[PDB]
Amino acid sequence: ETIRSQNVMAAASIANIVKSSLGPVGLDKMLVDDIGDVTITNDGATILKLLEVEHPAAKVLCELADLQDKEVGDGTTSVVIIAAELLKNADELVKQKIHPTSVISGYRLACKEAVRYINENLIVVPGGGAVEAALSIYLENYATSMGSREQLAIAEFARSLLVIPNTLAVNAAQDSTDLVAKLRAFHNEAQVNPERKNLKWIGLDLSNGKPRDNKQAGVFEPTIVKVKSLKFATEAAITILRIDDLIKL
Template identity: 70%
Template sequence: LNMANMDGDETFESTLLGEAEEVFVERIADDECILIRGTKNHSSASIVLRGPNEYFLDEMERSVHDSLCVVKRVMESKKVVPGGGAVEAALSIYLESFATSISSREQLAIAEFAKSLLIIPKTLATNAAKDATDLVAKLRAYHNSSQTKKEHTHLKWVGLDLHEGVVRDSVKAGVLEPAISKIKSLKFATEAAITILRIDDLIKLEPQKEDKKYGGCMDEE
């Protein structure tokens, strides 16, 4: 190992040097790692995960990766929306009201789309072993009030609290989601539904008919 350039000359630039408070070797589990702490420029960092077994570590790594992806999405879009099914409930109420203003058959499609959005809060409540019917009904009532009464506009942040089984202000509780992720998920789900509805062909496979005389088997001599 040397510091020769492509021409074979020994060169060195002091600007390439970094600064750190300490550099040491520490044994973590079965590996020896070189740790650098107190660097002058913090352009990157390492996260060390420890657990009882590999399966637990894999789950921890997945959770940390998901958390970092959420932070990345927020930094990209610089916008967040309340979680706990608040967005889906608000959209459902708005689209139901909008559907009644249309006098064509499109009203039915918009109304069904509004109804389908409630699958998200219903699934959240069901997965938490809560009464989905009661919670979603309360959630819809709050968002309907926020869109019809000016004095109740603050209720637009209301989402599900799956720990207590109630509805609450998701913004005050810190339950937020990246806006770009919510927009993309709605777009992709809509595109998938449209793609399925465009299919107008049906391929049906008829079951094979068994030979009644030989019970479906032919003996060869």
């Protein structure tokens, strides 16, 4: 084993800690103190400023999450999730002889061509899981029309952005694969069929188990939160990718 998979595992651990309290309806966590004073809370914005993280990669992830939180006071528990999913998929890539730099260039290209398409989803962003499931398909199409050593790091940036819609549906007791795949089947006929271009607002519903139009239902999210989250999760994944050794003094 190498110390890149260890950083990936640390980021994945802090993710799995935070990712079950994401949506509006999400279970709580208990943070046992030193004396034992327990605080039961969702809203990972606090679970990240109270968690005892000792690993350096988890530490950097917490630092960039808090930086995002103080830049804009929203979308700090999704940054950690997207970053850890980027790290998981980037480790799977590197483990088949894809240099971390090619993956980093791919993530840069993807995060730069995703905010240049979110400006075709803006009005605020539909929210829910709409922008994620739309960027998934758009980037999976934009990757293949490039064909460079980084054509595989944009298709693992597109299948790893649907971790928000895929964890917004296990925190709603509905499903993981079925609901997200109905979401990613409505957004397909919004980039393939020009008539049904209004199917790009169809996010998912957390009350009932069926995707609805999150423009005719007012579940918007400010564009500067989604853009900042994609732009900070990308930097977090990149920062934890560009390390490859731990020097002991």
